[PDB]
Amino acid sequence: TNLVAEPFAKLEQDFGGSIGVYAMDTGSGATVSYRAEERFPLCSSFKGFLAAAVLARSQQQAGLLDTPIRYGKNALVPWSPISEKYLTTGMTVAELSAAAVQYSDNAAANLLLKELGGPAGLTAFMRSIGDTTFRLDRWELELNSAIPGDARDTSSPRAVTESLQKLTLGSALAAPQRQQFVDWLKGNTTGNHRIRAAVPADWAVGDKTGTCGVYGTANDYAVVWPTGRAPIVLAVYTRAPNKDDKHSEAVIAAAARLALEGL
Numbered sequence: 001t002n003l004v005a006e007p008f009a010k011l012e013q014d015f016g017g018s019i020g021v022y023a024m025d026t027g028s029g030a031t032v033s034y035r036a037e038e039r040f041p042l043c044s045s046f047k048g049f050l051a052a053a054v055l056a057r058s059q060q061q062a063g064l065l066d067t068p069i070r071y072g073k074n075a076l077v078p079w080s081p082i083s084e085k086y087l088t089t090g091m092t093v094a095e096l097s098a099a100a101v102q103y104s105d106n107a108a109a110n111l112l113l114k115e116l117g118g119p120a121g122l123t124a125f126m127r128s129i130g131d132t133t134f135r136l137d138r139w140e141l142e143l144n145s146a147i148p149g150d151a152r153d154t155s156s157p158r159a160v161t162e163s164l165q166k167l168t169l170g171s172a173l174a175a176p177q178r179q180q181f182v183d184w185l186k187g188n189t190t191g192n193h194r195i196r197a198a199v200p201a202d203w204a205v206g207d208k209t210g211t212c213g214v215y216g217t218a219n220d221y222a223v224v225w226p227t228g229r230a231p232i233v234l235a236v237y238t239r240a241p242n243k244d245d246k247h248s249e250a251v252i253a254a255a256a257r258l259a260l261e262g263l
C-alpha cells in the first residue's frame with residue numbers, strides 16, 4: 001500500500017479516471033504503489049513481454065531470431081509502420097520483435113503471437129516466470145476494447161513491473177537474450193512524452209508504451225538507470241470510464257514523477 005497516497009489521489013481526481021502505479025528501486029527494495037493491485041488494459045504494452053517470450057524460445061530454437069517471415073498484405077492491420085515499410089522484403093523474427101517493441105507495430109505483434117501459439121501462448125510464457133496476473137486473450141486490434149471491468153487482455157501495474165524486472169535484470173532470460181530485451185526497450189521511439197519525460201535526461205531508459213485508443217486508457221513501463229545506482233523498474237497505467245475519454249500522456253509522466261520522487 002501507500003501511506004502518502006494523497007499526491008496520486010489528487011492527480012487521479014484531476015484526470016477523471018483511474019491511475020495505476022507500481023515502482024521498485026532494485027537496490028534498496030523500496031516501492032511506491034497506487035492501484036498497483038488493480039487490473040488495467042495492456043493495450044500495446046503486451047508487445048514488450050511478447051518480444052521476451054520470443055527471446056525465451058530462441059534459447060531452445062537456434063536461428064529462430066534470424067528466421068525470415070514472408071508475410072502478406074493482409075497481415076497489415078492499422079498502425080503497422082515497419083511491417084508496411086518492409087512488406088516487399090519480409091522481415092526476420094528479430095526485426096519483428098524489434099518493431100513490435102520500438103514502434104508498437106501491430107502486424108508484427110500478430111505475426112509473433114502466431115509463432116508462439118496466440119494470446120494463450122504468450123499467457124503461458126508469463127505464467128512460467130511467475131506472473132499469475134497477466135492474461136492476453138485477443139489479438140491486435142480487438143484487444144484494445146478497454147471495456148470497464150473486462151478482465152480480457154489485462155494485467156496489474158505490479159505484476160507488469162515484477163515481470164519486467166525478471167526479464168530485464170534477473171534470471172528469466174539467458175544473459176544475451178536478456179541484454180537484447182533491454183536493448184530493444186532502450187531503443188523505443190514511442191515513449192518520449194511518458195515515463196521518459198519524468199526521468200532526468202542523464203539516465204538511460206528503456207520503456208514500452210500501450211495506447212488503446214478509447215476509454216482514456218494508455219500506459220507505459222520502464223527500466224530506468226540512475227547515476228551510480230541499481231535500476232528502477234516502474235509501470236504507470238491509466239483508464240477512464242467513458243469510451244469518449246481522451247487518454248493523457250501528461251498524467252502518465254506526472255504519475256511516474258510522483259513515483260520517482262517517492263522513491
Ligand SMILES: C[C@H](CS)C(=O)N[C@@H](B(O)O)c1ccc(F)cc1
Nearest residue numbers: 043044079104141144210211212213
Ligand atoms: C487504436 C490504437 C491506435 S490509437 C491501436 O489500434 N493499437 C494500439 B495498441 O496500444 O494496442 C497502438 C497505438 C499506437 C501505436 F503507434 C501502435 C499501436
